[PDB]
Write a protein that binds this ligand. Structure first.
Ligand SMILES: O=c1[nH]c(=O)c2[nH]c(=O)[nH]c2[nH]1
Length: 223
């Protein structure tokens, strides 16, 4: 029952895909029964939707959770506070963080503070088989996250989208079709590094766009 698993706003917003969420629940049970594992932990799978739907001002889109055991924590790109070294994508994100914003290197890879402040860290696919990158594509997550993005875009509220998962022509449509949605283009991914990602200034440009739409900027500062 969605209201059990996600925040009040999110439970209402995701009502249309409530059965598909239940189905993914049956999928993950079937995987354990079949002797395959999944990440992140069951209690972290919908973690992105445990922060207030109404407060979201930025969407960061990834593709799939980290396939390495102990990395995936149910926020796109985030890792648990004791994870070191950081995955490549997150080191790349943090290099852009310091360059764009001028802040020092974060103390750890926990992006929880971004989530608390209205950054939706959403992966298109919300589970993965450990050590098998992108193993859960086409298992039914795509409809769920599409609806989430659709719902978010439909709010009479400012939204900036950052696309770090390369599915631009998949996602540009839903978003472009909302009232007050700005999409950061182009769509370099963290692993494209110095071929487009570094200097993309996603953070400062999100804040310029929010203030331009009469919204408060995000405080991007991590501890
Ligand atoms: O394209 C991606 N790369 C990652 O390294 C990653 N990590 C994550 O949670 N989502 C994504 N998406």
């Amino acid at each position: 029952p969605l209201s059990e698993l996600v925040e009040r706003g999110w439970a209402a917003a995701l009502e249309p895909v409530a059965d598909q969420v239940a189905h993914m629940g049956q999928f993950l049970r079937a995987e354990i029964a079949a002797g395959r594992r999944y990440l992140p932990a069951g209690s972290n799978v919908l973690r992105a939707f445990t922060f207030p739907f109404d407060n979201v001002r930025v969407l960061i889109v990834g593709q799939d959770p980290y396939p390495t055991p102990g990395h995936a924590v149910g926020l796109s790109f985030s890792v648990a506070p004791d994870v070191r070294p950081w995955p490549r994508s997150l080191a790349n994100i943090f290099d852009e963080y310091t360059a764009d914003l001028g802040y020092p290197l974060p103390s750890n890879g926990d992006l929880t503070p971004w989530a608390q402040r209205g950054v939706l860290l959403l992966n298109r696919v919300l589970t993965v088989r450990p050590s098998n990158p992108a193993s859960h594509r086409g298992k039914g997550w795509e409809a769920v996250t599409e609806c989430a993005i659709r719902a978010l875009a439909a709010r009479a509220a400012p939204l900036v989208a950052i696309l770090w998962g390369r599915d631009a022509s998949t996602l540009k449509p839903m978003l472009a079709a909302g009232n007050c949605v700005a999409i950061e283009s182009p769509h370099p991914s963290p692993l494209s590094a110095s071929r487009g990602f570094f200097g993309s200034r996603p953070f400062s440009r999100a804040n310029e766009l929010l203030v331009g739409m009469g919204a408060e900027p995000i405080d991007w500062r991590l501890p």
